[PDB]
Amino acid sequence: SQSQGIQQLLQAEKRAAEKVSEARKRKNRRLKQAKEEAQAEIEQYRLQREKEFKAKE
Amino acid sequence: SDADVQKQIKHMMAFIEQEANEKAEEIDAKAEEEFNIEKGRLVQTQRLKIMEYY
Amino acid sequence: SLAEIVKKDDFVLDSEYLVTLLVVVPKLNHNDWIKQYETLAEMVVPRSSNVLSEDQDSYLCNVTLFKKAVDDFRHKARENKFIVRDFQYNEEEMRADKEEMNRLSTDKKKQFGPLVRWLKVNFSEAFIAWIHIKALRVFVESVLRYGLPVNFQAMLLQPNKKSVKKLREVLHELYKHLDEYYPYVYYKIDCNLLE
């Protein structure tokens, strides 16, 4: 039956769907993680500016 | 010859399987670039606004 | 149209790396085509061909293959005298042909019935009115030919095709004192409206 050749085509397409789907999920996870690290660094800069301001006072 | 066609495709289809993986590795490389680009844009924009307030 | 023979189960679609193509081949070459399609391009799977339908001249089959193979496949199919005729399960096109078939076949009846009835009425009225004009031509000419206190009989003849010349001679002889042309009032009607 033609199903033998059709599944040999679909095997490579299934690899594409799986690999690209995981990579799309990794992109969304990374964009959230970038913001969560940015929120820590801006507070560390703010604390240093606060210390300097109190010293100037 | 059916056997030679089956052997030929079983080898040659691996190039499409390789490209199918490589596209996802390119998207993963873009995710690591966009992580650093977005992080840097966020931190510098806020740090300058915070510094101007003080 | 492919709309009569196409169904979704013969196709590989919705894919980044995969394509389906359609080919027509003359029935004498089909026994060679069954193996030859596996060799017309690189990156073609064995058993890729699925028949949709056959006729007195040819077979039409779907072919399933990797996206890089399609241009060499179509070009080498043409070199081997095969004809490409792509229709990748076009639901909109098969629907549009089926909708228009159901519509046009029905609208034909919706025109036909009223048209026959209207044509029967219009025929009757036009034929009646035609004879009223003929009667007026006879009447007006009689009134002109003899003056206003008219006393003319209106008469009909159906001429015999074998003796119409003798009829003309009789009609002249019966009316020679009243004055193609004739001494009496004359007009004709022909029923061969339908050829």
Among residues B18, B19, A9, B4, which one has the least CA distance to residue C44? A9
Which residue's entry shows tokens 């990156």? Answer: C43
CATH number at residue C3: 3.30.70.100
Among chain A residues, CA nearest to B36: A34
Q: Is C15 on the interface with B (CB under 8 A)?
A: no
- SS3 sequence of chain B: CHHHHHHHHHHHHHHHHHHHHHHHHHHHHHHHHHHHHHHHHHHHHHHHHHHHHC
The DSSP string of C96-160 is HHHHHHHHHHHHHHHHHHHHHHHHHHHHHHHHHHHHHHHHHHHHHHHHHHH-SS--PPP------
Among chain C residues, CA nearest to B11: C43
| Interchain contact, A45 vs B50, CB within 8 Å | yes
Å resolution of this model? Answer: 3.8
- Show the domain range for C84: 1-88
Stretch 6-45 of chain A: residues touching chain C, C-beta under 8 Å: 6, 8-10, 12-13, 16, 20
